Design a protein around this ligand. Structure first.
Ligand SMILES: Cc1ccc(C(N)=O)cc1N
Length: 209
């Protein structure tokens, strides 16, 4: 049972701008998603400070980067707070309408796409390198859900019957054909060292073969 939703017009506009603007510095997508994961881990850690049972769904707080050349996917896994179904529909827990408004005014005022995270909508930088993004998520207060969008103005949400997650979020990037450099170990390592060297959670780059 799959539900299909229309993006708010402003988010569809952000999404087409990310897809269509000529902008070579695409690697910042990874910094933005890792920072989102770090924010989500911060939230569940804070909740656990007064309620340790919040970690019954998993005590480890970490970020995994999983490239798969056969599927042409890069997956960013975290064990953060996750999101509810309501969160997923509400622009993946962001204030994306007002964030997009501020971002695009900054862009016409000299800013560039790499500054997207300063406006709270860094997630959508995924579409710099991904033709499709799948988000699997499990929040302590809800069931496991899968969000998916290939842009084009719509996204789907369904209950996820896939592998149980315990708690956290999985962002699966179905990479564009010419963006497979982000599946190579040395390229991912370089980006993590350049842009994510002070993230306060272990980042494990999985290897293949
Ligand atoms: C926008 C956004 C915010 C937080 C997370 C997460 N890692 O829980 C994922 C996304 N996509």
């Amino acid at each position: 049972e799959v539900e299909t939703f229309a993006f708010q017009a402003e988010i569809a506009q952000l999404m087409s701008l990310i897809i269509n603007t000529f902008y070579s510095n695409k690697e910042i997508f990874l910094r933005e998603l890792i920072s989102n994961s770090s924010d989500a881990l911060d939230k569940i850690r804070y909740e656990s400070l007064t309620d340790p049972s919040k970690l019954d769904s998993g005590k480890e707080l970490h970020i995994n980067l999983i490239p798969n050349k056969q599927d042409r996917t890069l997956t960013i896994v975290d064990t953060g707070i996750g999101m509810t179904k309501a969160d997923l529909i509400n622009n993946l827990g962001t204030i994306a309408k007002s964030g997009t408004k501020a971002f695009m005014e900054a862009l016409q005022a000299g800013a560039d796409i790499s500054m997207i995270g300063q406006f709270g909508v860094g997630f959508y930088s995924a579409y710099l390198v991904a033709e499709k993004v799948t988000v699997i998520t499990k929040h302590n207060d809800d069931e496991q859900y899968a969000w998916e969008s290939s842009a084009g103005g719509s996204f789907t949400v369904r209950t996820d019957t896939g592998e149980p997650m315990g708690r956290g979020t999985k962002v699966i990037l179905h990479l564009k054909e010419d963006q497979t450099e982000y599946l190579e170990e040395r390229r991912i390592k370089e980006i993590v060292k350049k842009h994510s060297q002070f993230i306060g959670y272990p980042i494990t780059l999985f290897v293949e073969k």
